[PDB]
Every structure is written in structure tokens, then in C-alpha cells.
Design a protein around this ligand. Structure first.
Ligand SMILES: Nc1ncnc2c1ncn2[C@@H]1O[C@H](COP(=O)(O)OC(=O)[C@@H](N)Cc2c[nH]c3ccccc23)[C@@H](O)[C@H]1O
Ligand SMILES: CC#CC(=O)N1CC[C@@H](n2c(=O)n(-c3ccc(Oc4ccccc4)cc3)c3c(N)ncnc32)C1
Ligand SMILES: O=c1[nH]c2cc(Cl)ccc2o1
Lengths: 333, 323
């Protein structure tokens, strides 16, 4: 049997080129090499307060976006997290092998709490324990994520090791798969602030389902530097805007930074921004064409969800049964 | 008919204070209310324990509740972990519970997240069954109020999805500690202060013989909680078992010493525990019966739990499961 890949994306906000380059792109490429399981984590999404209609719609948007990106329901398991009770079940049990200190220190909790001060709920605190359960249920070997999720994974490895130490080899210990380019794509007007899918300012983001023409305009208006002469070079501390653009260019084309720097020799930010704009505009136009064919076919989405959940439940139930046996619960008949 | 929900923790040996003081009451109200008894193994794992002891103690708890007279045909009795809706609703309710409310209940970096988050599970356990009444002790009054606040908050956003649970106000027997007659007899205790429902006649005698009395000269068997705590407890225990009034017993032991009282108390108690113990060992040593009660209970629980969770999930706006 192949090693298992597991990842998730929240059905909240609007997925960006950041979400694509740091996660989805890898998801699509791993599908034959490994046994891949992709999850729409609607249970994680409600740690920030959602309009009920927005959540339902955004869950089906996320599904259609996965399919449009090239996730193949014939190769991978695609499912919605809340359709598999084993996630919440393992999550509770895994709370009892997770320390408060491990949860208090989490950066996402801190950053989330400050932004939604009027909704610092216990789910937001306990977010990482559900995310561990998500991963450990499927005997996962690899987890393809962006750099912002590194510490959440690390806790899951500690949990898995902690549990195994007491009870034997119930879990596999997962390992991160973070891309070489575009693991943390930066905001257009704030190149020191990560690109957010729920940013107040849309001018910071390249949205995957945004009008391409609006994206070319955002790229032209992206912040650069006062360098005289203007030079296209990777200098993150001194050239964050230009660099982030060069990295976007790299990961869309597959080209190297050294190659790009060479290609833009004797040229300025006009040549740069024109090239990033052509690359990304062509990608979004193709993706969006696929997206609409999928998103408007409810019967197809419904089938994918149904088959997905069945496959996941077969894996999930097997793992939970052994967890429950280990911890000493009377087994259900 | 009001829905009553009780959590019975698979651990802890039940005392005579539990049986004649609480359970015996509720056995006799199973036609008055739709009573639900949930063995809460998911709550138990907040404290690390031996897995095989937890499994055994779950079945020990079930057998004893059946032996105390909980009828699986009138009441719903089941194991918490057999109904996934508990953990499912638990997570969803985490997202409507302030972190502050969990920290407001009784260094801390070394406690497991279970010990911190379990009141949300308690809220879910109760709210799943549209519960009207929750019989709670004072240790768990703060927890019920959190359950009430959570239900109201959710309801105000989404409509009347939950019933707002109420405490069961009415309390009737006072069973106090044998060597500390001011403290109520509790399983959580010096086992010389308590009498377990599975204790033998010989152990009962030894514990009652040690029970504190007073230095009154001559010894006088009269009820007086302030001045004669030990003797008063012995009288209350005897009354609870036999149904004889205190005044009747005060006459029955006129001109008698505390040894006579102690001897009669031990006979009465051991007399009561015997038919309980008979049913217990008979139920406990019948796997298929226990397995059948558990199967039936969980099916009944899941039928009702599933309708609440489905309405909660629709309100929140999750895409419904296809299956
Ligand atoms: N600007 C950015 N540049 C590069 N990568 C980025 C950028 N912003 C986001 N990402 C990555 O995109 C994925 C989706 O993030 P979400 O917020 O939906 O989703 C999250 O943040 C997860 N908690 C969802 C989750 C829940 N359970 C799981 C189990 C395994 C893996 C993942 C999950 C992520 O991989 C994230 O790292
Ligand atoms: C603040 C304070 C206080 C206080 O004085 N104490 C003493 C007992 C301490 N404490 C619990 O009460 N529980 C617990 C166990 C089972 C349970 O089941 C139900 C479910 C629904 C309805 C009734 C009972 C509910 C709670 C604890 C736990 N799981 N894990 C640890 N401690 C638990 C709280
Ligand atoms: O990860 C988690 N935490 C949880 C807390 C409750 Cl009450 C239920 C399920 C959970 O899953």
C-alpha cells in the first residue's frame, strides 16, 4: 500500500494564489505518487463566526475549486470534515493527551484572538487538537501545508508519539511537506504581511476566482522599492515587494529565481510586473473555466462528497476502534 | 413528560448514601420522567487511568445501576462513547463557548486539555437530548449554568434549537461519614468513612463498630446533630433502611447503649445490600445481557441525539451528509 498524504483547507473567505502555491499545487502533483486524502475542514472554519448561508456556499465553492485545480476524485479521497464523526470523536480523546501549555503558545490563536477579540472561543484555543485528529485518523505519512501551519503539525507529531509510547503503534508519526517556492506568499501592498484569504483590503491579494483583469491591475499597483536604478534582485529584507513578485513568477512558471534575475537583467519593474501579470492572468482564466463547469453541477459535487465520506469513514473508523481499545473503552456492538 | 439526564462516571464505588439518598429516589420516578443514564467514559479519561480497569468499571457501573433498579425498558441507559453525537456536538459547542468561561471554573500548563474543556462536553451531553431537568450536586452547579448560557446564546442566534435545562431542586436521606459525622459520605473519600454497596457483612460491622459516637454518661440514643453527630447519623442511616421514624427508634433504644444501635445498623444495612449484591453479580456476570442493554440504549440515545445534531448542523450551515 502507498504512503498516505492528508491535507485540509477551510471553507472560509476566498482562497488565494498563496493557498494555491503553498498547498493545492502540491496536492495535485502528489496524487499518483501517494494515496492522497483532501478534506474541506468546515468544523475548523467555525472557530471564526460565519454566516450560515456563506459557510454552506463556501464549502461547495472549496470543493469545486479543488476539482478545478486538478484534484481527481478517481485518484484521491475528497470529503467534508463534518460528514465523518470520527474527527470530533478522536479530537476529544486527543484533548486528554494534549497539555494546555502546548495550546496557549500557538501563533494562529494569538493572531486570531487579537483580530476577533469579541469571539475568543474555546474552539479557537483547541483548534490544534482537532487538526491532529484529522491527520492521525488516516495513518498519515505526509502533510502538505504552507509554512504558517508548521507548528500545528509539530504538536500532532508530539501527540502521536505521546500516545504511541503508552499504547503501542496506533498512530503513524506524520511529516511536513512544505514547497521550496511559494510556501508563504506575501500581501501585495504589505509584503511583510502574509497573503490572507480574509484580508480587509482586497488589493493585497490575488484571489483564485477573481476577475483576471482586476489581478493585472493589482500586480501593477504592487509595492516595490526606491532603488535607483530600479533592479530586479531577490533581497527579502530590502526588496520584499520585488522578491514576492519574483517568487510568484517562479512558482507559476517553474523557473528559478537565479533564472528570473538573469532574464530581467537590464530591465526594470515594468518588465517584471508585466510578466507576473501575464503568467497569473492566464492561469486564473483556465482555472475559472474548469471551476464553473464543476461548481454548477450539483449532482457531481454531491456524488464526490458521498464517495469521499464513505472512503474516509472506512479508514477513520479503523483507527478510532484501536484508539478506543487502547484507552480502555467498552467497544460498541 | 420531562427528559431527565444523569451522567454516571464509570469509576468510583457507589456508597449507601448514593443508593438510599439519590438512586433509590429516581428508580421510583421512571414512569414520571423520561430518564436518561449515560455512563460517561469520555469524561473519565480527563484523568489518566489503567485501560483495563476503565473497561471493567464501565461494566461494573452498568450492572450496579441495573441492580439498583434502573429499568432499561423504561429508562435509557447507555455508554457515552457509543454515541458519536456527544463528541460532535462537543466540538460545535466549543465554538460558542468563551475561553474565559472555562478558565472561570476552579502549573496549569501541565493539565491536559480534557481537564480544561470537559464542561463543554457536559453541555453537549445534556443539550443533545432536549433535556428539561439535570440532577446535579453543588460541585457541578457552575457547569449546569454554563450549559444554560451556551443553550441560550446558540438559541438567540439560530432560533429554539435547544431546551434550556433546569436543575432538579428537590433533594431525602442524610448519610454522613462514619469517622467525621459532619462531612457527607462520598465515594471520593479514608474508606473507613464510607460503606460501599458491594461491602460484605463482616466489613460493614467493622466500619460501624468504629463509627464515632459521644462521651455522654450514661450513653443515650437520642437525635441531636449539633451535640451528638455520630449517634444521629447512625439513627438516620437506620431510618433510611427500615423506614422507621426517628421518634420510634429513640423509643426502641431507650435505656440502651451505642453497641446495640451499632449492631442493629450493621444488620439493617447488610440486609439491604444483600438483594442489591445478588442482582449485581447476576447481572455483572452475564455479558450478553449487558451487551444487549448497551446496544438498545445507544440506539435509543442515537435516534434522539441525531435529530438534535442535524438541526444544530443545519443552523450552523454545514453541508448535510450524503451517505
Ligand atoms: N499566504 C500564503 N502563502 C502560502 N500558503 C498559504 C498562505 N496562506 C495560507 N496558506 C496555506 O494554504 C492552506 C489553506 O489554509 P487554510 O487557512 O484554509 O487552512 C488552515 O490553515 C489549516 N488549519 C486547515 C486544516 C485543518 N485541519 C488540517 C489537517 C491537515 C492539514 C491542514 C488542515 C494551508 O496549508 C496554509 O498553510
Ligand atoms: C470547577 C469545578 C469543580 C468541582 O468541584 N469538580 C469536582 C469534579 C470535577 N469534574 C466534573 O464534574 N467532571 C465531570 C464528569 C462527568 C460529567 O458527566 C455528566 C454529564 C452531563 C450531566 C451530568 C454529568 C460531567 C462533569 C469532570 C471531568 N470529566 N474531569 C475532571 N474533573 C471533573 C469538577
Ligand atoms: O478536538 C476536539 N476538542 C473537542 C472537545 C469536545 Cl467537547 C468535543 C470534541 C472535540 O474535538
Amino acid at each position: 500500500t502507498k504512503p498516505i498524504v492528508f491535507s485540509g483547507a477551510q471553507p472560509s473567505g476566498e482562497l488565494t494564489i498563496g493557498n494555491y502555491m503553498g498547498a493545492l499545487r502540491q496536492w495535485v502533483n502528489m496524487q499518483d505518487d501517494y494515496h492522497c486524502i483532501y478534506c474541506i475542514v468546515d468544523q475548523h472554519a467555525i472557530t471564526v463566526r460565519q454566516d450560515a448561508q456563506k459557510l454552506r456556499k463556501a464549502t461547495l465553492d472549496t470543493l469545486a475549486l479543488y476539482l478545478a485545480c486538478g484534484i481527481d476524485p478517481e485518484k484521491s479521497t475528497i470529503f467534508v470534515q463534518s460528514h465523518v464523526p470520527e474527527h470530533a470523536q478522536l479530537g476529544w480523546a486527543l484533548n486528554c493527551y494534549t497539555y494546555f501549555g502546548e495550546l496557549s503558545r500557538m501563533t494562529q490563536f494569538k493572531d486570531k484572538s487579537a483580530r476577533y477579540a469579541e469571539n475568543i472561543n474555546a474552539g479557537l484555543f483547541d483548534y490544534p487538537v482537532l487538526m491532529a485528529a484529522d491527520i492521525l485518523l488516516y495513518q498519515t505519512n505526509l502533510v502538505p501545508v504552507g509554512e504558517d501551519q508548521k507548528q500545528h503539525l509539530e504538536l500532532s507529531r508530539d501527540i502521536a508519539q505521546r500516545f504511541n509510547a503508552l499504547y503501542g503503534e496506533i498512530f503513524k508519526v506524520p511529516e511536513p511537506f512544505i514547497p521550496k517556492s511559494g510556501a508563504r506568499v506575501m500581501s501585495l501592498l504589505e509584503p511583510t504581511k502574509k497573503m490572507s484569504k480574509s484580508d480587509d483590503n482586497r488589493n493585497n491579494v490575488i484571489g483564485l476566482l477573481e476577475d483576471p483583469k482586476s489581478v493585472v491591475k493589482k500586480i501593477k499597483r504592487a509595492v516595490t522599492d526606491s532603488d535607483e536604478p530600479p533592479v530586479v534582485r531577490y533581497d527579502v529584507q530590502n526588496k520584499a515587494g520585488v522578491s514576492n513578485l519574483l517568487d510568484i513568477l517562479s512558482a507559476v512558471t517553474g523557473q528559478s529565481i537565479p533564472e528570473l534575475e538573469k532574464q530581467f537583467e537590464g530591465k526594470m519593474y515594468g518588465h517584471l510586473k508585466g510578466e507576473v501579470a501575464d503568467a497569473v492572468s492566464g492561469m486564473l482564466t483556465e482555472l475559472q473555466e474548469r471551476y464553473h463547469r464543476f461548481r454548477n453541477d450539483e449532482a457531481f459535487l454531491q456524488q464526490v462528497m458521498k464517495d469521499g465520506a464513505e472512503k474516509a469513514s472506512a479508514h477513520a473508523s479503523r483507527t478510532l476502534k484501536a484508539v478506543y481499545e487502547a484507552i480502555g473503552f467498552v467497544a460498541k456492538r
